[PDB]
Design a protein around this ligand. Structure first.
Ligand SMILES: OC[C@H]1O[C@@H](O[C@@H]2[C@@H](O)[C@H](O)O[C@H](CO)[C@H]2O)[C@H](O)[C@@H](O)[C@@H]1O
Ligand SMILES: [Ca+2]
Length: 769
């Protein structure tokens, strides 16, 4: 490996061999159907709201999230980088597709498939990933750095449906070597959104742009139709000329054929025919090819950038709503702008690299923190772009002030912005993209007083219930199968209108967003104040025994639905105490003196009764009235965790918080599979896992990373990182269960999972507060 020294891969990058097999991969632990796309995954490409493309460590473009809110795992075999190499003076060279695999059927059979094992590595530190190619039969060694410009405090480039592929080639041998690199791409218009004649009208054309300082050559793959539908638009691939390379191209080859129309050209001398056949197709899949060829002298290095753009301006949801994607603000809405996006990328990618380096550097250069933590911290961010992210720039047919946003809970549980989950999972947004975070929270503020009196069938039991109650925060803001932002509370397995934790978490989130953006945004507090008071006032009504705290009802009425709570619980109780103190503070800031007095009085009463009812001398009991009431809950002090972040001080005694945390570490962590798998949710004081419900026996990834941050705030540094380590190990390490770039909600003791590709573990960013 002589190429690794020529490029700059951080030591914290997650790593795996190209073509490596993995023996210990987990699978779903539930009986109902659930996504399992295997461990062949990689860092996604594409901005927020653009639709994402998952290119795997084997090199294939395989995890497609271009249809917003859907996960489609299939390798489009025509989408590849390929290499040609011939030592100067030799009769023949070699051509090889850079993909550790081959097609299932007979299409593209003439191409050289099956990139061999132990001949390269994949690296990932999101938003960057890398492939190196160190192959006995390729004298020139190659590496590519691939990324999308995902940049904190940047709401423009971060939206772009674009990827850059910066290739570096180096000749360690004592002879001249001719090298070509070819990017192939299928015209994917009609890949989704067309019921019949999926390729019909598709056509490809070559664009050349030569404006003195920059020569760019591109293929634009679109359709003859000018219909404004979610299926229509353009894909583009291209390259920028550098000194000492030449560009060749082929606008049209057939993806539904043996591939020899392209390969007989490329495998001969690495130079394509330069034909621009713009003729539309009927039934055949078609594609485009862009190649660069150059001669490398001994010890010479060269750098050449390729790019990929996709202008698919319209997203459609199952209920019929069509919206424009965010990036259309900067490039237009007519779906004929793929080249413009590509060009911007090819002329600005160096600036984007240094912008990405600037926001990774403070963490990467802090040598007090171990590399494994940085691996998780950065790579967990995959989910912001990959989580079916919806970011609208107008409804199709309708200007606008605000641009609504939605990130999914996950793909299995297809709900936008599930509030109880985002309580943990929204840390990256508040810390790095706060305007998005504030917009999401204003969306929630606007739903508080919505009333929908029509009834729905509750799934868990069968009972009927009202859809949306006035003054109760919704579970979610809809589903991609229905109408995001318009039809809220898509979740129906329980009744969220009786939950005792959503209203509190809502309040805590509002105050969080004020505090972590510098305590300067009074206007955000004013926008949300009515909703905050309403939310706490309705929750106070659920105090049935008059201890000042809402009663859990021994039925599904919080996040841990099936692991029931009854009476005063540590979880809902602590969240309530923290929320009341939060509302106190907003009262002071806004000079709402009566609110302050009221929430102060409610707080003191509730605080005293919480302590008296739940403190047992070592920890806080799970609740007052359950069968499993003395179980040790990992999340028992969620309220105090948020209070630390919100700088609200001690809601419970320091000494008692410390003991409770030491108990959780000693029990839920250390006595669960030797602390190598995170914190199991519930442990009985005899040191045996609480078996009363499946959720109690689960490790929740995001709860565990949140728990770790809480320990870190309280000076338990060793305990924090040891707790987090088990989650890192399970996700990323060769000894874990192969969940890289699909971190699940949960696992049980056997390492098998529930709900891959989950929002909650983004809570790791709470460790950076
Ligand atoms: O894992 C906790 C989260 O669970 C989600 O609830 C449901 C599943 O637990 C259940 O098995 O199936 C339905 C199918 O739609 C899921 O919604 C909730 O959405 C989350 O609020 C909860 O935190
Ligand atoms: Ca009560």
């Amino acid at each position: 490996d002589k190429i690794s020294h020529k490029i700059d891969i951080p030591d914290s990058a997650w790593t795996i061999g190209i073509g490596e097999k993995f023996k210990n991969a987990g699978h779903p632990n539930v009986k109902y159907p659930m996504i399992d796309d295997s461990y062949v995954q990689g860092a996604p490409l594409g901005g927020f709201g653009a639709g994402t493309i998952g290119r795997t460590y084997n090199g294939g473009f395989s995890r497609w999230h271009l249809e917003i809110g859907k996960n489609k795992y299939t390798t489009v075999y025509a989408n590849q980088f390929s290499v040609f190499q011939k030592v100067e003076g030799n009769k023949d060279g070699v051509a090889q597709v850079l993909y550790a695999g081959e097609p299932e059927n007979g299409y593209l059979s003439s191409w050289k498939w099956d990139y061999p094992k132990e001949s390269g590595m994949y690296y990932a530190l999101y938003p960057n990933s890398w492939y190196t190619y160190t192959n006995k039969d390729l004298p020139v060694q190659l590496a590519v750095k691939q990324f999308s410009p995902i940049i904190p405090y940047n709401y423009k480039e971060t939206s772009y449906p674009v990827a850059v592929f910066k290739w570096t080639a180096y000749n360690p041998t004592n002879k001249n070597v001719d090298v070509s690199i070819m990017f192939t791409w299928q015209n994917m218009i009609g890949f989704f959104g067309k019921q019949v004649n999926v390729n019909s009208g598709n056509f490809n054309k070559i664009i050349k742009d030569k404006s003195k300082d920059s020569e760019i050559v591109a293929a634009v793959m679109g359709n003859i139709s000018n219909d404004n539908e979610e299926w229509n638009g353009e894909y583009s691939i291209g390259v920028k000329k550098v000194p000492g390379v030449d560009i060749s191209y082929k606008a049209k080859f057939v993806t539904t054929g043996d591939g020899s129309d392209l390969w007989h050209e490329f495998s001969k001398n690495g130079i394509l025919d330069n034909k621009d056949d713009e003729t539309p197709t009927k039934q055949d899949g078609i594609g485009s090819a862009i190649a660069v060829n150059f001669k490398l002298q001994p010890g010479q290095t060269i750098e050449v950038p390729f790019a990929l753009s996709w202008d698919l301006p319209i997203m459609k949801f199952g209920g019929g709503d069509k919206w424009y994607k965010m990036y259309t603000k900067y490039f237009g809405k007519n779906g004929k702008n793929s080249f413009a996006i590509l060009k911007e990328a090819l002329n600005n990618y160096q600036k984007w690299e240094k912008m990405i380096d600037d926001w990774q550097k403070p963490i990467l250069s802090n040598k007090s923190k171990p590399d494994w933590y940085k691996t998780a911290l950065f790579n967990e961010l995959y989910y912001l772009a990959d989580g079916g992210t919806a970011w609208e720039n107008g409804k199709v047919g309708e200007k606008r002030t605000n641009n609504m946003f939605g990130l999914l809970e996950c793909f299995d549980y297809n709900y936008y912005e599930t509030l109880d989950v985002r309580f943990y999972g929204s840390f990256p947004l508040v810390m790095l993209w706060p305007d998005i975070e504030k917009q999401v929270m204003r969306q929630f503020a606007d739903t508080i007083n919505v009333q929908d009196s029509s009834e729905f069938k509750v799934g868990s039991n069968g009972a009927m219930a009202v859809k949306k109650v006035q003054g109760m925060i919704p579970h979610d803001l809809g589903s991609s199968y229905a109408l995001p932002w318009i039809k809220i509370n898509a979740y129906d397995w329980q009744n969220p209108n009786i939950w005792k934790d959503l209203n509190s978490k809502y309040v805590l989130l509002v105050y969080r967003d004020y505090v972590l953006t510098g305590k300067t945004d009074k206007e955000f507090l004013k926008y949300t104040w009515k909703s905050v008071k309403t939310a706490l006032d309705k929750l106070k009504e659920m105090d049935k025994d008059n201890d000042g705290i809402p009663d859990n009802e021994g039925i599904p009425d919080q996040t841990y639905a099936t692991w029931s709570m009854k009476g005063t619980s540590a979880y809902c109780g602590s969240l309530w105490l923290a929320a009341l103190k939060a509302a106190q503070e907003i009262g002071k800031v806004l000079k709402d003196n009566e609110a302050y007095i009221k929430y102060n009085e409610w707080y003191k009463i509730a605080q005293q009764n919480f302590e008296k009812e739940l403190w047992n001398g070592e920890y806080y009991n799970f609740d007052t009235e359950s069968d499993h009431k003395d179980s040790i809950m990992a999340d028992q002090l969620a309220g105090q965790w948020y209070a630390d972040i919100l700088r609200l001080g001690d809601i419970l005694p320091k000494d008692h918080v410390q003991k409770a945390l030491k108990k959780i570490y000693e029990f839920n962590v250390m006595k669960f599979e030797n602390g190598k798998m995170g914190a199991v949710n519930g442990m009985r004081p005899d040191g045996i896992v609480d078996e009363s419900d499946i959720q109690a026996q689960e490790v929740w990834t995001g709860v565990t990373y949140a728990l770790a941050s809480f320990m870190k705030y309280r000076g338990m540094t060793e305990e924090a990182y040891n707790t987090a380590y088990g989650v890192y190990k399970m996700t990323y390490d060769k000894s874990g269960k192969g969940y890289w770039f699909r971190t699940p909600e949960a696992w049980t003791k056997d390492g098998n999972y529930r709900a891959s590709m989950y929002m909650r573990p983004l809570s790791i960013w709470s460790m950076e507060v």
